[PDB]
Amino acid sequence: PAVHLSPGQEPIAVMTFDLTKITKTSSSFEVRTWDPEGVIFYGDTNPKDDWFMLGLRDGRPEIQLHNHWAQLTVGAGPRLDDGRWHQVEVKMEGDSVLLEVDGEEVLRLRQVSGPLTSHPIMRIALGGLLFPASNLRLPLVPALDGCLRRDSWLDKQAKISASAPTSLRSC
Amino acid sequence: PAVHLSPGQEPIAVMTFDLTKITKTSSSFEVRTWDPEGVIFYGDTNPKDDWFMLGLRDGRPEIQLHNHWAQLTVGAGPRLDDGRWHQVEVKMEGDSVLLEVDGEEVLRLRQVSGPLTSHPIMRIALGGLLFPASNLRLPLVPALDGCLRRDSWLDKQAKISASAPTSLRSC
Numbered sequence: 001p002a003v004h005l006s007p008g009q010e011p012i013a014v015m016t017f018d019l020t021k022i023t024k025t026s027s028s029f030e031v032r033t034w035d036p037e038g039v040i041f042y043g044d045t046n047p048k049d050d051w052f053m054l055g056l057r058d059g060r061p062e063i064q065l066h067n068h069w070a071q072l073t074v075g076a077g078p079r080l081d082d083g084r085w086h087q088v089e090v091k092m093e094g095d096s097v098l099l100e101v102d103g104e105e106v107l108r109l110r111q112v113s114g115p116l117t118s119h120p121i122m123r124i125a126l127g128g129l130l131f132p133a134s135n136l137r138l139p140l141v142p143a144l145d146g147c148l149r150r151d152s153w154l155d156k157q158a159k160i161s162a163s164a165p166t167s168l169r170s171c
Numbered sequence: 172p173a174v175h176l177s178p179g180q181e182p183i184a185v186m187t188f189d190l191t192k193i194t195k196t197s198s199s200f201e202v203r204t205w206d207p208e209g210v211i212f213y214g215d216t217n218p219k220d221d222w223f224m225l226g227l228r229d230g231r232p233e234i235q236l237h238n239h240w241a242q243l244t245v246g247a248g249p250r251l252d253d254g255r256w257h258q259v260e261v262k263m264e265g266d267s268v269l270l271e272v273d274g275e276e277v278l279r280l281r282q283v284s285g286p287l288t289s290h291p292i293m294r295i296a297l298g299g300l301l302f303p304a305s306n307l308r309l310p311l312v313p314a315l316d317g318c319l320r321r322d323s324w325l326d327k328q329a330k331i332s333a334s335a336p337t338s339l340r341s342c
């Protein structure tokens with residue numbers, strides 16, 4: 001069962017987590033698209049100075065990140081806009097964030113985060129940002145005309161709230 | 172004709188460039204190694220606050236960079252410590268630094284540099300750093316037991332000096 005990721009650029013779903021209860025710090029999903037550019041997911045504890053975006057630009061994964069330890073805009077991995085399903089896994093390990101595409105590690109951002117446990121509320125938004133696209137380090141057009149399935153986000157034990165699925169649209 | 176990249180951790184060669192004469196901002200070489208960790212090349216305009224390192228860690232490319240615009244430690248691309256020759260190309264394009272391995276773009280560090288043209292002296296060191304390994308953002312053991320061939324560095328028109336090849340050791 002798959003869902004569409006995208007007129008407005010609002011995300012299709014938002015989840016909130018209690019950071020003091022996170023034990024699993026990874027997320028996995030599959031994505032399919034013919035679209036070269038857009039947001040796959042966004043997360044923050046504060047949209048002004050502690051946020052993260054995973055998207056596509058020119059078909060390839062791009063991460064933008066802004067927190068106390070790091071500020072970066074990085075592209076990596078193969079093009080994903082070929083209309084095939086691709087597995088993507090994001091993992092936080094130690095002080096690094098890892099990106100795996102189709103079971104291959106394609107990017108490791110080292111020394112970018114202290115302990116999640118140590119503002120204890122994190123938001124994850126699917127298919128859009130929780131601020132205007134002009135707030136990005138490098139703007140992109142957020143609407144990703146793609147589909148998402150088999151998605152699991154961090155720790156269901158730590159989840160406080162999740163948006164009304166009434167809005168989800170099947171692919 | 173190939174040369175060894177590595178007891179001391181000193182680089183095997185240093186070149187100096189006039190930054191005001193650089194037109195070609197790319198470098199290409201081939202590397203072969205069974206070694207998972209070490210420095211491939213280092214460059215700077217100032218070893219205290221304007222420097223760059225490309226190496227291997229756990230077999231894969233790693234870039235460490237520290238300048239006015241960016242400070243990062245990033246891993247990307249496939250393992251290269253399989254004893255096969257691999258082409259590596261580093262390109263500066265706009266404000267980004269691009270890494271290509273075997274003809275595939277594996278990493279794009281965006282918004283990390285202003286114009287090279289605009290201290291106008293850049294050093295490139297092969298197989299070692301021009302400061303102690305403890306100065307790195309994330310230390311590694313610099314000696315890379317590998318071989319280097321078909322290597323071209325930036326713009327021969329901009330090169331001011333190049334170290335005595337008397338020291339080079341054929342593979």
Ligand SMILES: C#C[C@]1(O)CC[C@H]2[C@@H]3CCC4=Cc5oncc5C[C@]4(C)[C@H]3CC[C@@]21C
Pocket residue numbers: 025026027042043044045050051052065067090091092097113116122124154
């Ligand atoms: C706290 C904090 C932060 O400094 C601010 C925003 C956080 C990301 C939000 C989204 C996210 C989702 C996610 O899914 N698997 C692992 C992760 C971890 C990441 C990449 C989080 C890593 C730590 C980040 C950068």
Ligand SMILES: C#C[C@]1(O)CC[C@H]2[C@@H]3CCC4=Cc5oncc5C[C@]4(C)[C@H]3CC[C@@]21C
Pocket residue numbers: 196197198213214215216221222223236238261262263268284287293295325
């Ligand atoms: C100036 C300046 C800097 O901010 C300080 C050190 C510079 C690198 C030195 C080594 C280098 C060699 C090289 O080989 N092809 C392209 C490049 C460009 C790079 C990656 C350079 C990019 C710009 C850098 C980060």
Ligand SMILES: [Ca+2]
Pocket residue numbers: 035036037038141142143144145
């Ligand atoms: Ca789009």
Ligand SMILES: [Ca+2]
Pocket residue numbers: 206207208209312313314315316
């Ligand atoms: Ca080594």
